[PDB]
C-alpha cells in the first residue's frame, strides 16, 4: 500500500530527470550533413542445399566462413568465395532457433525449443565434428546465444532470465532477473563487458556481466521486441518490434534519439544490423524484402527484394565488404 | 584452378549429394500439432517437446506436444492441428471457446485446417440424465434451442443428450463459419476415453485436406 506510492514517486523523478536533458534532437544537428543517396546492391552468390526455412545465421571472424541453421535438422558451414561446402552437422533436435560462431574459429553453438545449448568442436584429430558439452538449467526455450571466449557464453531464454555459463564445468555462475516477459535478443559489447537484452514486455535492459546487476531500463515500444543491435562505439542501441517501428537509444542520455517508421510498412521486424561505420542501418521485414535505413536521418536509402518469403536472418562481415540474408524459402544470398 | 580447389569441389559435391538424399525420407512423414488445456485428455486421444509416432495404412505420422504467442510461429508447415476440449465441465467451456477463437484467427495458421475433438461424452450424458445441473444455469440461450429435424442420433440414445451434444457442437462450429473464406475447414468429432477409431479419423481428414490442395492446384476450384 505504501510501496506503490514510493515506486510511482521514483518513476516520476526519473521521468523528470530524463526530460531535463532533451536540449536537442538528431533531426536538427544533421541538417548540415549530406544524404548518402541511392545505394544499389546486387546478388553475387546464391547458396543452395537447405530444404527448409532458415532461422539462424552468423558470420566468422575471417570474413569467409559462414554458418546457417534450418528446420531440416542440419547445420552447414559455407565458403562464401567459392560456394563450396566445408561441414554439415546433424542436430539432435530439429527445432533449432539460434546459432553462434566462436571468435577463435574452433567451436559453434546452437539451441532451440529443447531448452539446451549445445557446443560443437570443429577441430579434432579424428576429422569428425563431435559434441563437446550440453548446457542445461533453463526452464523455457532458448532464443539467443553469444560467445565471450572459449570458456564463457551468455544465453537468453523465454523464462524471463539470462545466464552466464562456464563451459569447462557446465555450471551457471550468474543469473540475470528482472524481466517480466520472454527474452528475445542479445547483443554483446565490443569490450566484452556489457550486454543488452530485449523482451516481450516492450522494455530493454543493460546488464553488468561482472556483477550480475541491471544498470538501466528503457521503455517506449508498444509490443514485443524481436531484435537488438549494437552501435560500434558501445554507447547506442538499435531495437526492432512487431509494431513496425525502430528506435535508437543512448546509454549516456538515457532516452530515445530517433524513430524509424513509414506509413506504408505494416509488418513486423525480424532482424537489425549495422555497417562498420554505423552510417547504414539494415532491417528485415515480413513484407518479403529488406530495407536500408540512414541512421542519422531516418530516411530510406535502398531495398533488397530477392526473396520469396519472410526474411529471418541478417548479418555483416567484420571487414564490411558483404551482407548475408536468409529467408524461409531455403536460400541464402550474399550482397555487395 | 589448383588441385586442392578441385578436391574441395568434389567434397562439396559429395556433401550436396548427401543433403539431397536425406530430404527424400523427410517428405514421407506427415506432421501434426497437438494443443489443448488441462483435464482435456490430450495424452489419450491416440493411445521441452513430447513426441509420438504411429502409422496407419503405410502412412507415417509424427505428432508434437509443446509443454504460445511466439513458439507457434514455427508450426506453420504442419498438415493439421488437433484441439481437444472437455465437454463435461460447463464452468470452463467459455475458456475453451476463447482459446479456439484465438487459435482459429491466428495470422500464422491461416492455411491450416483444424481437427476438433470433443471428449468425454459419457460423463456429459450421465450428468444430463442425473439432472443435478442444468446448462441454462450458464447458457441462457439453450432453453430456446430445439433439436434439428436432420439430426441422426445413435439408436438407443435418449433424446436429451443429443440436444446438449448438438448445442455444444453448434457453439463450437459457429466460430469456424464466421471467418476463413474457404481457406481452411474444421472437422468436429465426438470421442471418449475408450474409443480406438480415432486413428482413422486423422488419416481420413488428412487425405481430404491433401485432395483439396490438389484440386486447388489444377485450377478446378
Amino acid at each position: 500500500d505504501q510501496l506503490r506510492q514510493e515506486a510511482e514517486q521514483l518513476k516520476n523523478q526519473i521521468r523528470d530527470a530524463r526530460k531535463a536533458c532533451a536540449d536537442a534532437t538528431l533531426s536538427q544537428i544533421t541538417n548540415n550533413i549530406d544524404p548518402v543517396g541511392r545505394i544499389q546492391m546486387r546478388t553475387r552468390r546464391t547458396l543452395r542445399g537447405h530444404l527448409a526455412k532458415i532461422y539462424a545465421m552468423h558470420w566468422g571472424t575471417d570474413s569467409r566462413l559462414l554458418v546457417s541453421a534450418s528446420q531440416d535438422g542440419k547445420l552447414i558451414i559455407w565458403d562464401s568465395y567459392t560456394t563450396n561446402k566445408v561441414h554439415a552437422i546433424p542436430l539432435r533436435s530439429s527445432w533449432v532457433m539460434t546459432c553462434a560462431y566462436a571468435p577463435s574459429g574452433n567451436y559453434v553453438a546452437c539451441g532451440g525449443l529443447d531448452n539446451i545449448c549445445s557446443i560443437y568442436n570443429l577441430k579434432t584429430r579424428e576429422g569428425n565434428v563431435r559434441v563437446s558439452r550440453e548446457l542445461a538449467g533453463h526452464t523455457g526455450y532458448l532464443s539467443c546465444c553469444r560467445f565471450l571466449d572459449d570458456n564463457q557464453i551468455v544465453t537468453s531464454s523465454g523464462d524471463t532470465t539470462c545466464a552466464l555459463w562456464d563451459i569447462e564445468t557446465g555450471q551457471q555462475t550468474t543469473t540475470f532477473t528482472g524481466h517480466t516477459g520472454d527474452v528475445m535478443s542479445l547483443s554483446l559489447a565490443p569490450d566484452t563487458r556489457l550486454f543488452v537484452s530485449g523482451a516481450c514486455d516492450a522494455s530493454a535492459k543493460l546488464w553488468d556481466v561482472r556483477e550480475g546487476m541491471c544498470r538501466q531500463t528503457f521503455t517506449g515500444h508498444e509490443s514485443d521486441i524481436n531484435a537488438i543491435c549494437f552501435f560500434p562505439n558501445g554507447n547506442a542501441f538499435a531495437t526492432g518490434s512487431d509494431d513496425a517501428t525502430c528506435r535508437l537509444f543512448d546509454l549516456r542520455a538515457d532516452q530515445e534519439l530517433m524513430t524509424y517508421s513509414h506509413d506504408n510498412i505494416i509488418c513486423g521486424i525480424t532482424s537489425v544490423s549495422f555497417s562498420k561505420s554505423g552510417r547504414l542501418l539494415l532491417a528485415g521485414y515480413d513484407d518479403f524484402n529488406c530495407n536500408v535505413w540512414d541512421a542519422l536521418k531516418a530516411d530510406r536509402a535502398g531495398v533488397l527484394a530477392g526473396h520469396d518469403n519472410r526474411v529471418s536472418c541478417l548479418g555483416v562481415t567484420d571487414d564490411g565488404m558483404a551482407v548475408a540474408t536468409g529467408s524461409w524459402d531455403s536460400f541464402l544470398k550474399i550482397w555487395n | 584452378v589448383s588441385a586442392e580447389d578441385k578436391a574441395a569441389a568434389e567434397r562439396s559435391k559429395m556433401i550436396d549429394k548427401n543433403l539431397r538424399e536425406d530430404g527424400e525420407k523427410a517428405r514421407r512423414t506427415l506432421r501434426l500439432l497437438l494443443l489443448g488445456a488441462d483435464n482435456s485428455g490430450k495424452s489419450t486421444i491416440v493411445k521441452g517437446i513430447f513426441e509420438t509416432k504411429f502409422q496407419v495404412d503405410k502412412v507415417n505420422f509424427h505428432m508434437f506436444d509443446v509443454g504460445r504467442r511466439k513458439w507457434i510461429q514455427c508450426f506453420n508447415d504442419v498438415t493439421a492441428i488437433i484441439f481437444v476440449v472437455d465437454s463435461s465441465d460447463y464452468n470452463r467451456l467459455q475458456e475453451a471457446l476463447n482459446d479456439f477463437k484465438s487459435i482459429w484467427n491466428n495470422r500464422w495458421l491461416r492455411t491450416i485446417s483444424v481437427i476438433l475433438f470433443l471428449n468425454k461424452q459419457d460423463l456429459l450424458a450421465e450428468k444430463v440424465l442425473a439432472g443435478k445441473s442444468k446448462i441454462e444455469d450458464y447458457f441462457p440461450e439453450f432453453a430456446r434451442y430445439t433439436t434439428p429435424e436432420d439430426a441422426t442420433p445413435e439408436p438407443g440414445e435418449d433424446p436429451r443428450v443429443t440436444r446438449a451434444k448438438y448445442f455444444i457442437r453448434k457453439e463450437f462450429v459457429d466460430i469456424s463459419t464466421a471467418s476463413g473464406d474457404g481457406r481452411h475447414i474444421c472437422y468436429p468429432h465426438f470421442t471418449c476415453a475408450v474409443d480406438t477409431e480415432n486413428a482413422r479419423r486423422i488419416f481420413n481428414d488428412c487425405k481430404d485436406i491433401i485432395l483439396q490442395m490438389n484440386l486447388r492446384e489444377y485450377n478446378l476450384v
Epitope: 579424428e126 | 584452378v1 588441385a3 578441385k6
Partner: single-chain antibody, 230 residues
Framework: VQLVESGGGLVQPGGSRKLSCSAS????????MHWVRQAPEKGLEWVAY????????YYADTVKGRFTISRDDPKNTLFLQMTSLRSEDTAMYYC??????????????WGQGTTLTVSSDIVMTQATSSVPVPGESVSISCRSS???????????LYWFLQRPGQSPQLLIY???NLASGVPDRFSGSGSGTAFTLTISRLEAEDVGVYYC?????????FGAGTKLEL
Amino acid sequence: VQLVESGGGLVQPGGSRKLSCSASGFAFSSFGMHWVRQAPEKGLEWVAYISSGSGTIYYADTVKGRFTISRDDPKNTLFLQMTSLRSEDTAMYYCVRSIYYYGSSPFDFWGQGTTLTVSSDIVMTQATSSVPVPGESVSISCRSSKSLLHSNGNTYLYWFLQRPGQSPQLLIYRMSNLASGVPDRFSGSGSGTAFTLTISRLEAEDVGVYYCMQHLEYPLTFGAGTKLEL
C-alpha cells in the same frame, strides 16, 4: 590415428605382389590417401593418389600401366597392385593421409612402411650435403624451377623432417603455417622461387634430413634433402 602397412618381401623380376594398409582411429571414408616411395639413395618419390570418394585417380609417369590402386571403405583398407616389377622398384613404401578443404593440413600423418626387394615437371633444387652444427641458429634453403605462387594467394610448399629410424613428420604447410604438435622454434618464409627454413634453437631431437615438396601440379616432386649433423 594409426596407420599400419603390410606385405612386402623378396620377389623375382617379372613377378607381382599386392600391398595392403590398415587404417584405424579416424573417419577413413573422409580422407584421401597417397603412396610415396623412398629408395636408399634416391629420396622420396610419389607413386599414386586416390580420392576419398574414388572419383579421381592419378599415377606417376614411371608407373602407368603397371600399378593399380584401390580403396575399401567398409573394411578401412587400402590396396596397391603391382605387376611386371623391375629392379628400380626396390624401395620403402609409405602410406599418407590427406584431406582437402579450406584451412586443412593435407600431409599431417605418415605411416611406418614396408620393404620390397627385387632380385614440364617442376624441378625442386637443394644444394647442401651436410651442415655441421646446440643453441645455434640453422637456416636451410630450397629453390624451385617455376613459381609456386597461385593467383588465389596461396603458395604450395611443404616441409618434412625425417629422424633416424622414424617416418617423415610435417612441420610447415603453405610456407607459414605451423603444424599441430610442433614447438614454436620452427619458422619459414620466402617468396617466388626462393624459400628458407629457420630454427631458432637446436636440441638433440632436431637431427635429420629436411625435404621440400610442391603441390601445384601432378606429378608431385620432392627435393634432394639436406642433412643436419649435430
